[PDB]
Amino acid sequence: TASADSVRAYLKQIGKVALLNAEEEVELAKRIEAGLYATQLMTELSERGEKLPAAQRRDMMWICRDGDRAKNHLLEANLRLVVSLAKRYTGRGMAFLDLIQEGNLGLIRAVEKFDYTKGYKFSTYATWWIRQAITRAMADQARTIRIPVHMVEVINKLGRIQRELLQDLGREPTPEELAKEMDITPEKVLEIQQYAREPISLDQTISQLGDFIEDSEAVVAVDAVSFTLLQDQLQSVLDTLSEREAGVVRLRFGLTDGQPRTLDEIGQVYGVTRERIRQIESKTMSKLRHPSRSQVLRDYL
Amino acid sequence: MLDVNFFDELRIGLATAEDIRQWSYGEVKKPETINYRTLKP
Amino acid sequence: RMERVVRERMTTQDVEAITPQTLINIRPVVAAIKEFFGTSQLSQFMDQNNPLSGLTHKRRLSALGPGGLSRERAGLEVRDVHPSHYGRMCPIETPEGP
Amino acid sequence: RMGHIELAAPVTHIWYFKGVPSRLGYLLDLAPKDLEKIIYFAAYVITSVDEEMRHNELSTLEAEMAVERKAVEDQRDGELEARAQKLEADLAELEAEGAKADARRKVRDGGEREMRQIRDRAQRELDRLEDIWSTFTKLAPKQLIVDENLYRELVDRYGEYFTGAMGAESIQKLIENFDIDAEAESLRDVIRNGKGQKKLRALKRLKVVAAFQQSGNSPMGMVLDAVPVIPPELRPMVQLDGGRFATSDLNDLYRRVINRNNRLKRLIDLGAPEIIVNNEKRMLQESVDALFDNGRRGRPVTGPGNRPLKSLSDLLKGKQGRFRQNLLGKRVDYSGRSVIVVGPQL
Amino acid sequence: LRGSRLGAVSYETDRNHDLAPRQIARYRTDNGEEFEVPFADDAEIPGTWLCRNGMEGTLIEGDLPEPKKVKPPRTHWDMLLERRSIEELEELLKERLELIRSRRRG
DNA sequence: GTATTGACTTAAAGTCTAACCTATAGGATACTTACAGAGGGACACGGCGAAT
RNA sequence: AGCGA
DNA sequence: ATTCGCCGTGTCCCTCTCGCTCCTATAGGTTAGACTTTAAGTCAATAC
Structure with missing residues (x-):
């Protein structure tokens, strides 16, 4: 047998309960609405309300539990509608079961927000609610990257237009062609193509691509020691100059803590004015541009 | 986690839920990876 | 594949309104041809380092392929030279590798 | 750095099940x-029993069953009386006119066969009742418990007396209510005194039982409540030059679990029928x-191109596991x- | 054929010489669990924080600025009341009440 | 060389408005069961026969 | 996917 | 019919190395974009 198919097991499961008709649906809807109002009234009467008479409390609690019963009965009734609807979409989505469950969520929404006084079979409203929920969940859970609904819709419209034009014309149209067809810009079309891209799988057969994936962002393995020696040389050169000049440069360019101190802060910490320090900075940088202080640093670019 | 060549035993063992949620640094609860537009997690 | 699509829409499409232009789909046919010529272990890259190699890569017989025996199943049994090869398949030339 | 997912419902580990x-x-x-x-x-599993309460409500519910079967016999002798009146009507409408000797009694056989199949109905439903009572x-x-x-x-008739549940949480409850020590000593007695298949099975089981007893290992970890998540650089999405992203094929599985867990959480918060929740x-x-x-139990979960996905087990099994690809050698x-040449003057 | 990550090499090795002076804050969870998170001198401690466990945790020092609940979720009660009326639902309740009555005691 | 004051332009924020993405809810005729489309050694789950 | 030892 | 001893069949992990080339409607968040302010950097002259 090898009965490990949850699909067939679930179908066999949902085949147990019988399908219903319009008057039965009206009865169930009335029962659920009455049960909900009963629970609401009992909560209201439990808080600063009234000591519910034993018999009244009893039969209204019965009404509540029976409303829940009817809700569940209806959901069991229309599971088959869910599967029948879900069949069309499968082929471009996830596990069938996921779509079925989204359909069930749409059903509980529909049975929550159904009205019987309009005198209609429940099937249509159920259908629309189901489809809305399925499409929403499919979109939210389609790709490893998330693409919100309106952009999903324009992507689908672009795809349908391109496919029908391929069927009719026979050639793949152009970005300007799709821009004029969809009343949008060619750059927008290009962006929709770009965001339409789906990730490739690191796992493949060729071997796996993961083998040949150079780590362009990684240890350079030479610039590390290069920067170490660089810093050593800068400390040396700064020691060659005056200590005040060296400290001023270190604070100006953040060589001591990584925090770049500016003219007002350095003038404050040296007890002088920012123009004084600007003169200091200009003279020191002019001193540094003199090649004897720069022959040992020129090669570091 | 981080040590030196001090090694005498490699003990495998069946893990427990307290051990798992003590291992972890947070509770992932959303099925998303990267923002499609800015390419940030 | 084309035929399955055609017969599928051959019912859904309304009658007295359709034509082979609206019925036929050439996308899967062109895709099949392209997927054969590219990325198939018989649509081999032309091995032309000398004119003789250009000739000999053609006329080449390969027993491994789709609908064929890969080296996993292509054991020694099929690698010998049955006496029927005389005049039909050279016994000498064959790659020295696996 | 690792993550974890708190599951709204405990789930059994696969290796120790399959x-x-x-x-x-x-x-x-x-x-x-x-x-x-x-x-x-x-199927459901009973994970507890209260033999005393069943033992006295046995008398009470056997009285109830006597009442129920006496009502069944009230229905059955109602059938007897009704078909007897209809059979005497057959008498009054077959032996009271000019008719054929056998056609007047074809209704006789029809009514008698109706009573035969009707007592078959009553007998089979009574047998069902006897079966369910014996089962209790x-x-x-x-x-x-299947069916x-x-x-x-x-x-719903014996809601007390036991905790009958279904699935991983029921298995958790069973492991909770399980004395390893007395069971292990029972297996020790069985291998002390038994023979043949019984002793062989006792050995096979006592193996794992004593394995769990000797260590400080609780068997609670067999069923799972928080599933860890592997650090992201080990399942990276590295972009290729051109925006073609390269996921690691574990992200889709971690998604699947996250989406289904969140759906379960919302379903339980909202209030959903047993069928939907158990599904x-x-x-x-x-x-x-x-x-x-993936691919252990049932159909392997496929990806695009009907390619099976690479679960965690597949990262170690076979020739392409870590135990080989980076342990059979490294660059x-x-x-x-370079090519070599002969160096006779060396 | 190559790839990169949105990361910073920041070739700086390590520095234990100067660490931006920092105290440590603590936000106990709802189940007697404490998960310390360090915070700088210039750090503006939150009233409550997403702790290491995952659930929301409040600072040990007693502040309690206002949990400030958000809009109730759309309850089936909500979508029923926004399209029906109290008197009509009450009439329905009486209908089913008398229904079960007449069912029970006749 | 070192430390100042008074224009004179400049980058870095701060803000206001805003404008443009983005997440969420709903759509009320009828609409009721997925799909399918090698070989070898070794062990464990199970045929065939004598005994009590 | 193809190829050399 | 169960026991114990044989056979028999079905399901599963493993096998050289190295290289090369569908739509609508709301409400809220985000960023963006430009106008305005301010600390900031510069230049010219100057006195000691």
Whole structure:
């Protein structure tokens, strides 16, 4: 047998309960609405309300539990509608079961927000609610990257237009062609193509691509020691100059803590004015541009 | 986690839920990876 | 594949309104041809380092392929030279590798 | 750095369920064929029993069953009386006119056959009642129950006396209520005194039982409540030059589990029927089993191009596991190669 | 054929010489669990924080600025009341009440 | 060389408005069961026969 | 996917 | 019919190395974009 198919097991499961008709649906809807109002009234009467008479409390609690019963009965009734609807979409989505469950969520929404006084079979409203929920969940859970609904819709419209034009014309149209067809810009079309891209799988057969994936962002393995020696040389050169000049440069360019101190802060910490320090900075940088202080640093670019 | 060549035993063992949620640094609860537009997690 | 699509829409499409232009789909046919010529272990890259190699890569017989025996199943049994090869398949030339 | 996912419903680990020999099967003394039906929500399991309460409400409910079967016999002798009146009507309408000797009694045979099949109906339903009563009398804990209708009747008429549940949480409850020490000593007695298949099975099981007893290992970890998540650089999405992203094929599985867990959480918050909730728990189970070893139980979860996905188990199994690809050799820095020539003057 | 990550090499090795002076804050969870998170001198401690466990945790020092609940979720009660009326639902309740009455005691 | 004051332009924020993405809810005729489309050694789950 | 020892 | 001893069949992990080339409607968040302010950097002259 090898009965490990949850699909067939679930179908066999949902085949147990019988399908219903319009008057039965009206009865169930009335029962659920009455049960909900009963629970609401009992909560209201439990808080600063009234000591519910034993018999009244009893039969209204019965009404509540029976409303829940009817809700569940209806959901069991229309599971088959869910599967029948879900069949069309499968082929471009996830596990069938996921779509079925989204359909069930749409059903509980529909049975929550159904009205019987309009005198209609429940099937249509159920259908629309189901489809809305399925499409929403499919979109939210389609790709490893998330693409919100309106952009999903324009992507689908672009795809349908391109496919029908391929069927009719026979050639793949152009970005300007799709821009004029969809009343949008060619750059927008290009962006929709770009965001339409789906990730490739690191796992493949060729071997796996993961083998040949150079780590362009990684240890350079030479610039590390290069920067170490660089810093050593800068400390040396700064020691060659005056200590005040060296400290001023270190604070100006953040060589001591990584925090770049500016003219007002350095003038404050040296007890002088920012123009004084600007003169200091200009003279020191002019001193540094003199090649004897720069022959040992020129090669570091 | 981080040590030196001090090694005498490699003990495998069946893990427990307290051990798992003590291992972890947070509770992932959303099925998303990267923002499609800015390419940030 | 084309035929399955055609017969599928051959019912859904309304009658007295359709034509082979609206019925036929050439996308899967062109895709099949392209997927054969590219990325198939018989649509081999032309091995032309000398004119003789250009000739000999053609006329080449390969027993491994789709609908064929890969080296996993292509054991020694099929690698010998049955006496029927005389005049039909050279016994000498064959790659020295696996 | 790792993550974890808190599961709204405990889920059984796959290795200790499916890999033959089944470790849960040997720990709980359950057949794998019947344990699959439990952890995949195909059958219920009784995880407790109160023999005293059953023992006295046995008298009370046997009186109730006598009442029920006497009502059944009230219906049955109602059938007898009604068909007897109809049969005397057949008398008055077949032996009171001019008719054929056999055609006047074809209605006789019709009514008698109606009573025969009607008492067949009554007998078969009474036999069903006797069967269910006998099942209740001989019910025990740690026991399997198929026939959802039978289980539903059993619970809603005997909701006490036991905790009958379905799935991973029921297995958790069984492991909770399980003295390893007395059971191990019982297996020790069985291997002390027994013979043949019984002793052989005792050895096979005592293996894992004593394995768990000797260590400080609780068997609670066999069923799972928080599933860890591997650090992201080990399942990276590296972009290729051109925006073609490259996921690691574990992100889709971790998604599947996250989406199904959140769907379960919302369903339980909202209030959903038993069918939907149990189905959701089954999908959560399947998602976790696929995450840990895809292709082990049932159809392997495919990807685009009908390619099976690479779960965690597949990262170690076979020739392409870590135990080989980076342990059968590594590329090394400060290396080179070249063709060689003979160096006779060296 | 190559790839990169949105990361910073920041070739700086390590510095234990100067660490931006920092105290440590603590936000106990709802189940007697404490998960310390360090915070700088210039750090503006939150009233409550997403702790290491995952659930929301409040600072040990007693502040309690206002949990400030958000809009109730759309309850089936909500979508029923926004399209029906109290008197009509009450009439329905009486209908089913008398229904079960007449069913029970006749 | 070192430390100042008074224009004179400049980058870095701060803000206001805003404008443009983005997440969410709903759509009320009828609409009721997925799909399928090698070989070898070894062990464990199970045929065939004598005994009580 | 193809190829050399 | 169960026991114990044989056979028999079905399901599963493993096998050289190295290289090369569908739509609508709301409400809220985000960023963006430009106008305005301010600390900031510069230049010219100067006195000691």
